[PDB]
UniProtKB/Swiss-Prot annotation, chains A, B, C, D, E, F, G, H:
N-terminal signal peptide: none
Gene3D superfamilies associated with the record: 3.30.70.920, Winged helix-like DNA-binding domain superfamily/Winged helix DNA-binding domain
Organism of this sequence: Pyrococcus furiosus (strain ATCC 43587 / DSM 3638 / JCM 8422 / Vc1)
Keyword line: DNA-binding, Repressor, Transcription, Transcription regulation
Location of the DNA-binding region in this protein: 20-39
GO molecular function list: sequence-specific DNA binding
Chain's role: DNA-binding protein that negatively regulates its own transcription. Interferes with RNA polymerase (RNAP) recruitment by inhibiting the association of RNAP with the TBP-TFB promoter complex. Binds to a 46-base pair sequence that overlaps the transcriptional start site of its own promoter.
Domain of life: Archaea
Keyword Transcription regulation annotated: yes
Annotated InterPro entries: ArsR-like_HTH, AsnC-type_HTH_dom, Dimeric_a/b-barrel, HTH-LrpA_regulator, HTH-Siroheme_Decarb, Tscrpt_reg_AsnC-like, Tscrpt_reg_AsnC/Lrp_C, Tscrpt_reg_HTH_AsnC-type_CS
Domain writeup: Consists of an N-terminal domain containing a helix-turn-helix (HtH) DNA-binding motif, and a C-terminal domain of mixed alpha/beta character reminiscent of a number of RNA- and DNA-binding domains.
Protein name: HTH-type transcriptional regulator LrpA
Subunit structure: Homooctamer; tetramer of dimers. Forms a homodimer mainly through interactions between the antiparallel beta-sheets of the C-terminal domain, and further interactions lead to octamer formation.
CDD domains found in the cross-reference section: HTH_ARSR
Length: 140, 140, 140, 140, 140, 140, 140, 140
């Protein structure tokens, strides 16, 4: 996308309430345009949706963990949807890294991680290895 | 946080434009409350900010890559801030996984990945190993 | 063999329809030394065959993957054979590396790669693990 | 493209001097449909070239090795380029796997392999590590 | 807590029968400040218990081993519990490292270590893999 | 040694201030058999010392980490010695595992752990790599 | 052992036919002594036996391979004795390295290795991973 | 080699003092032949030499260790000869396994291993990683 639309996504991704009117003065173009642009990005799908960036330490989620999930080859997708279903898997990927599954989980402590691993993820038919990697700090 | 505030963050994280008024009818409480709550989460920091969820395939970023960055122990933080500075490092972590640095990079193709790796990340004073793991699909 | 063979061999891997006369003037040798040479090369199995260098990129295969395939030790030769049957498996090795079965897979995209692994390789009986390394550029 | 292309492509990788007439009667299509087809294939870069399948075993290369080459991150593109210059490096990749540089090396024997690693690859400046996996059989 | 606690704590891990008076003259504080301090330490669970540092070497245990124990994900908590029952398992962790179960095992010799792995750990149901790292010297 | 020693040893690791009389009635042996036993145990170095089991969790150390420390081979004994000097290093080993130096580190939180690695361990000269595995629960 | 007996084993290990008489003049002692010594080492077991050092390349065993053999923990010893039984396992160890079993196998070629692996070692009830590492050259 | 010569090497490798005369009656052939054969194997090089199989536990060498030695690619052979020179490297190989060097070292204890590693092998110009794997038991 155009340069203008690139700037507009930069800006919105920093504060998605920036009012159109502010974008327009940022770009030298006008509201209607900033409007039009925004909608068009939205209709296209570049803007999937309007969301919120939520802080895990302040919700008490002290161990944001990147968890690997190995699987019997044959049950990759069956595991993946049941990991999809748990509310502590805050985002799920198929990867070409060491483990195909790759969950960004939020546990609140070692015993919560250890609990989740074994009682929730460890018990999914098909799961052959959970490999949790705890995030020391988020930098960007 | 309270259960009500948990629901309110669920909802907002699904569409952070849901109007207060809709939250209120969702919870059986009232606008003012949904208002008050929201602000309070915001002032607290549970709501870091209002943002946008942007689709890499439709921006032409076909290889969303989880890149490991090894470093000389002594230059961890110096590497980390220069990786922080590049606009293709869409999020940066310190981890207890195989590589301390852990960048979620967006390249547009193998040659873009290979370019970025070696010409941009590979040349940061201190970087001793880039380990890129390409995301086959995002599931959540 | 001899130097002119290695050169003839070099030339022929480059352009297999290279005229014998241009081979000839290059080596500074009759077309009929060439011709004779080409055919002992062919005779002895040194040239085992004439084929076409095909570009995956132009054919929709943007993801050339080196997939290691781990397997139940009983079944290494079964899984190889179910793997060679498939058209995505472009070349297939029994190797001493980290995985006994090594395949060069051509998938369209991440999704396609995700799909081949999970639905076609993965369900082969005896496959204990698929390990894809995506190739970024081919340099020779 | 279309099925007859994929088949023509199949046939041509098998025996590149396959008569167009046999291609033709097989697809059940004129020699001149074939001929036209072959040349849009050639035109579009799908057939990028005619070459010879050469057997290392008969040429004294009994050790076909997949050598991963680790390297100082600064110098990944230098080391690739000093590597492609050499004749033992039969094919050379920039890959996402455990090692950025991946080469298919043909050495005569263990000793020869030991020798190429230590004396020719190893001394290339910037090579931090050579990782050879010897191939046992080639199956496709 | 406070510095004198950390020091009292230091002293007490060194010689747990250190007189309170020597603690006392060292910190330059009454025996009865000490005494009070020791017991809020004891009260709050900071001192959780008095025990003996035992030397494996003099007890015939010349092989202090850190044994990672891999396991079927279903059964991580079963295998831990069958492991803690045994006397060779001196300390037992649920860790985020390469293996979820981590034990500090004391075997007499290689043979004994071979034996514990194969006959006692190994047969525990659900153990998919034992990974022993023998400790060479203990330095603190 | 003998069974009553192993039991006395068991009892004493449990509660080191266990009365000799309760040891005694348990083994069914004089206080003065006990007393004698305890002191040959002490004499021979089997009991090498009396210390306190200290709980990191209550002391603010919520992150008990097993940190492998890789190092320039020249400097393995230097780096160990600069490591034992530090108070976060609670126990320190020279081990046969994946890393020669193995330390049990107590950091407050992820950040603190990030900090110790980068600022205190990492800058030790000769440290080529820090490898932290966070412990989730301690079970014995 | 004594210094004299150390020298005598050095010498014998270089040529175990060196006649006693030559040892004696080597040491300044006498035949009878060199005799006595030798016998005593033999009776003790320091000299397990008199054997021959046999060259694998000249027997046509071009791939002397250090093979890892993973196993279900429970069937370690059952695998080990059946690997013991094959005549191509020229020496078998239990190790604390990556794989407990560790065979020094002699195959004659990649296809022999690949054959042995899968048809002989790969089919032992219990074997979960063969990891062959080919010796490029023997240096001592 | 012939079947007869295979048997003769089996036999000799079990006791290389078996007198010719015993081989001959074992094979049904005659002394002179068994003679002739033996010499011919010797002159050929299949019999490199006559040696002794020496027991490390009874010499007090309790940790027979398979040590990996990583190296800067460029200094492979320079390291290898200095490892060749130490009397505790009882046999040295170049490998295609994880580490090119591969020493079978005999230390007498953890502190001897740890000493050797760091003071002797760790200090060889060029050595970038020692990876010792202790043999629990020898089975063949």
């Amino acid at each position: 996308i155009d340069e203008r639309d690139k700037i507009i996504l930069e800006i919105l991704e920093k504060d998605a309430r920036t009012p159109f009117t502010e974008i327009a003065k940022k770009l030298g173009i006008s509201e209607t345009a900033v409007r039009k642009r925004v909608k068009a990005l939205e209709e296209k799908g570049i803007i999937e949706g309007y969301t919120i960036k939520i802080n895990p330490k302040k919700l008490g989620y002290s161990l944001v963990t990147i968890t690997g999930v190995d699987t019997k080859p044959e049950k990759l997708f069956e595991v993946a949807e049941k990991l999809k279903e748990y509310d502590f898997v805050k985002e799920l990927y198929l990867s070409s890294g060491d483990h195909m599954i790759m969950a960004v989980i939020w546990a609140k402590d070692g015993e919560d991680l250890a609990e989740i691993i074994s009682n929730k993820i460890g018990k999914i038919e098909g799961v052959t290895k959970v490999c949790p990697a705890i995030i020391l700090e988020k930098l960007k």
